[PDB]
Amino acid sequence: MISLADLQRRIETGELSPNAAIAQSHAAIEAREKEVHAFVRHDKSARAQASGPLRGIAVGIKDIIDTANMPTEMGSEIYRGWQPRSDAPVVMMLKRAGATIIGKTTTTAFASRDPTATLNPHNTGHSPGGSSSGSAAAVGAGMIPLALGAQTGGSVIRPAAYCGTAAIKPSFRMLPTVGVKCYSWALDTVGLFGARAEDLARGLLAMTGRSEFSGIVPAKAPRIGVVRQEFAGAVEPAAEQGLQAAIKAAERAGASVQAIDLPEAVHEAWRIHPIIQDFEAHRALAWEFSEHHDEIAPMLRASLDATVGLTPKEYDEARRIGRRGRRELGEVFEGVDVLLTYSAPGTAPAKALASTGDPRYNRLWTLMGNPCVNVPVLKVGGLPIGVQVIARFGNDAHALATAWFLEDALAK
Amino acid sequence: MISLADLQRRIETGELSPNAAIAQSHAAIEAREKEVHAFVRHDKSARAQASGPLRGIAVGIKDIIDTANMPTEMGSEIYRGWQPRSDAPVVMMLKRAGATIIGKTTTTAFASRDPTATLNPHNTGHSPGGSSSGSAAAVGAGMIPLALGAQTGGSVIRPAAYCGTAAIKPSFRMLPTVGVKCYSWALDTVGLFGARAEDLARGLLAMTGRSEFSGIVPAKAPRIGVVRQEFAGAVEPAAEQGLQAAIKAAERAGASVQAIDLPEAVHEAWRIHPIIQDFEAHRALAWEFSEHHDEIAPMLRASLDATVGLTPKEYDEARRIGRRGRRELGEVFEGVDVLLTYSAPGTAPAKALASTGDPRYNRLWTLMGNPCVNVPVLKVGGLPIGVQVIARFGNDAHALATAWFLEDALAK
Reduce the secondary structure of A227-275 to three states and give it as a string. Answer: CCCHHHCCCCHHHHHHHHHHHHHHHCCCCEEEECCCCHHHHHHHHHHHH
Q: Least CB-CB distance to A92: which of B68, B286, B311?
A: B286
Q: Which residue in B has a C-alpha nearest to residue A289's C-alpha? A: B92
Q: What is the DSSP letter of B193?
A: E
Of A27, A227, A54, nearest to A143 (Cα)? A27
Residue B31's Cα: distance from chain center in Å? 24
Distance from C-alpha of B216 to C-alpha of B232, rounded to nearest angstrom: 33
Distance from C-alpha of B45 to C-alpha of B50, rounded to nearest angstrom: 16
> A354 near A302, Cβ under 8 Å?
no
Distance from C-alpha of A364 to C-alpha of B85, rounded to nearest angstrom: 33
Distance from C-alpha of A188 to C-alpha of A176, rounded to nearest angstrom: 10
Strands A372-380 and A383-391 turn out to be: antiparallel
Domain ranges in chain A are: 1-412
Q: What are the distances in angstroms from CA A288 to CA A86, A297, B22?
A: 21, 11, 26
Mutate to test the interface with A, among B49, B86, B152, B320 (most CBs of A within 10 A): B86
Q: Least CB-CB distance to A284: which of B89, B208, B291?
A: B89
Sign of the Cα pseudo-torsion (B288, B293, B295, B299, in order): positive
Distance from C-alpha of B247 to C-alpha of B249, rounded to nearest angstrom: 6
Sign of the Cα pseudo-torsion (B172, B178, B184, B190, in order): negative
What residues are paired with B387 via a beta bridge?
Answer: B342, B375
Contact between chains at B82 and A79 (C-beta distance less than 8 A): no
Q: Least CB-CB distance to B209: which of A88, A95, A312?
A: A312
Q: What are the distances in angstroms from CA A89 to CA A281, B26, B77, B151, B280?
A: 22, 39, 20, 20, 10
Q: How far is A140 from chain B (nearest CA, A)?
A: 29
3-state SS, one letter per residue, for chain A: CCCHHHHHHHHHHCCCCHHHHHHHHHHHHHHHHHHHCCEEEECCCCCCCCCCCCCCCEEEEECCECCCCCCCCCCCHHHCCCCCCCCCHHHHHHHHCCCEEEEEECCCHHHCCCCCCCCECCECCECCCCCCHHHHHHHHCCCCCEEEEEECCCCCHHHHHHHCCEEEECCCCCCCCCCECCCCCCCCEEEEEECCHHHHHHHHHHHHCCHHHCCCCCCCCCEEEECCCHHHCCCCHHHHHHHHHHHHHHHCCCCEEEECCCCHHHHHHHHHHHHHHHHHHHHHCHHHHHHCHHHCCHHHHHHHHHHCCCCHHHHHHHHHHHHHHHHHHHHHCCCCCEEEEECCCCCCCEHHHCCCCCCCCCHHHHHHCCCEEEEEEEEECCEEEEEEEEECCCCHHHHHHHHHHHHHHHCC
> A191 near A156, Cβ under 8 Å?
yes
Reduced to 3 states (helix: H, G, I; strand: E, B; else coil), residue B259 is strand
φ/ψ (deg, to 5) at A374: -90, 135
Q: What are the distances in angstroms from CA B134 to CA A284, B371, B387?
A: 26, 22, 21
Which positions in chain B touch A176 (Cβ < 8 Å)? 182, 185, 280, 283-284
Contact between chains at A312 and B93 (C-beta distance less than 8 A): no
Residues 6+ apart with CB under 8 A from B62: B104, B105, B106, B107, B111, B131, B132, B134, B135, B147, B148, B149, B150
Q: What are the distances in angstroms from CA B51 to CA A343, A350, B19, B54, B121?
A: 48, 48, 12, 8, 32
Distance from C-alpha of B356 to C-alpha of B347, rounded to nearest angstrom: 11
Distance from C-alpha of B57 to C-alpha of B10, rounded to nearest angstrom: 12
Distance from C-alpha of B92 to C-alpha of A289, rounded to nearest angstrom: 10
Q: At what angle do helices A89-96 and A197-208 cross, to 10 degrees?
A: 100
Q: What are the distances in angstroms from CA A255 to CA A217, A340, A393, A409?
A: 16, 12, 21, 10
| Cβ–Cβ contact B280 with A under 8 A | yes
> A147 near A62, Cβ under 8 Å?
yes
Residues 185..214 of A with a Cβ closer than 8 Å to B: which?
185-186, 208-211
Please give the full DSSP string across B331-377, using - where no structure is assigned: HHTTT-SEEEEESSSSSPPBGGG-----GGGTHHHHHH---EEEEEE
Question: What type of residue sits at position A83?
Answer: Q
Residue A262's Cα: distance from chain center in Å? 23
Q: Which residue in A has a C-alpha nearest to residue B67's C-alpha? A: A287
Documented resolution in Å: 1.9
> A408 near A401, Cβ under 8 Å?
no
**Burial class of residue B14, CB neighbours in 10 A (0-12, 13-18, 19+):** exposed
Contact between chains at B178 and A173 (C-beta distance less than 8 A): no
Distance from C-alpha of B325 to C-alpha of B316, rounded to nearest angstrom: 14
Q: What is the DSSP letter of B308?
A: T
| Cβ–Cβ contact A61 with B under 8 A | no
**Burial class of residue A139, CB neighbours in 10 A (0-12, 13-18, 19+):** buried
Residues 6+ apart with CB under 8 A from A13: none
Q: How far is A223 from chain B (nearest CA, A)?
A: 27
Please give the full DSSP string across B5-39, using - where no structure is assigned: HHHHHHHHTTSS-HHHHHHHHHHHHHHHHHHH--E
Q: Which residue in B has a C-alpha nearest to residue A80's C-alpha? A: B85
**Burial class of residue A312, CB neighbours in 10 A (0-12, 13-18, 19+):** middle
Mutate to test the interface with A, among B69, B92, B110, B314 (most CBs of A within 10 A): B92
| Cβ–Cβ contact B313 with A under 8 A | yes
Task: Give all strands of the β-sheet with A39-42 in edge-to-edge order.
Answer: A39-42, A100-105, A58-62, A146-151, A189-194, A166-169, A372-380, A383-391, A338-342, A223-226, A256-259
Question: What type of residue sits at position B334?
Answer: E
Residue A314's Cα: distance from chain center in Å? 29
Mutate to test the interface with A, among B94, B101, B287 (most CBs of A within 10 A): B287
Of A44, A92, A36, nearest to A67 (Cα)? A92
Sign of the Cα pseudo-torsion (A41, A47, A48, A51, in order): negative
Contact between chains at A209 and B89 (C-beta distance less than 8 A): no
Q: At what angle do helices B197-208 and B89-96 cross, to 10 degrees?
A: 100
Distance from C-alpha of A224 to C-alpha of A209, rounded to nearest angstrom: 28
Task: Give all strands of the β-sheet with B256-259 in edge-to-edge order.
Answer: B39-42, B100-105, B58-62, B146-151, B189-194, B166-169, B372-380, B383-391, B338-342, B223-226, B256-259
Residues 6+ apart with CB under 8 A from A264: none
Method used to obtain the model: X-ray
| Cβ–Cβ contact A85 with B under 8 A | yes
Which positions in chain A touch B204 (Cβ < 8 Å)? none
Distance from C-alpha of A141 to C-alpha of A106, rounded to nearest angstrom: 14
Distance from C-alpha of B18 to C-alpha of B65, rounded to nearest angstrom: 25
| Cβ–Cβ contact A279 with B under 8 A | no
Give the torsion through C-alpha atoms of A290, A292, A295, A299, to 10 deg: -20
Distance from C-alpha of B215 to C-alpha of A19, rounded to nearest angstrom: 66
Of B149, B49, B34, nearest to B96 (Cα)? B49
| Cβ–Cβ contact B71 with A under 8 A | no
The alpha helices in B109-163, defined as continuous H runs, are 133-140, 157-162
> B91 near B309, Cβ under 8 Å?
no
Residue A393's Cα: distance from chain center in Å? 17
- Taking CA A160 as the corner, what is the angle to CA A304 and CA A381, rounded to the nearest 5 degrees? 110
Q: What are the distances in angstroms from CA A177 to CA A135, A148, A315, B185, B267?
A: 17, 12, 22, 9, 29
Sign of the Cα pseudo-torsion (A232, A237, A241, A244, in order): positive
Reduced to 3 states (helix: H, G, I; strand: E, B; else coil), residue B245 is helix
Strands B166-169 and B146-151 turn out to be: unpaired
Distance from C-alpha of B365 to C-alpha of B103, rounded to nearest angstrom: 29
Q: Which residue in A has a C-alpha nearest to residue B310's C-alpha? A: A209
Of A216, A208, A165, nearest to A400 (Cα)? A216
Q: What are the distances in angstroms from CA A386 to CA A16, A375, B44?
A: 32, 5, 59
Distance from C-alpha of A365 to C-alpha of B259, rounded to nearest angstrom: 44
**Cα diameter, chain B:** 61
Mutate to test the interface with A, among B49, B61, B82, B85 (most CBs of A within 10 A): B85
Q: Which CATH architecture has domain A1-412?
A: Alpha-Beta Complex (3.90)
Residues 6+ apart with CB under 8 A from A36: A118, A119, A121, A124, A128, A137, A138, A141, A143
Q: Least CB-CB distance to A287: which of B92, B208, B286?
A: B92
Q: Is the peptide bond before A343 cis (omega within 30 degrees of 0)?
A: no
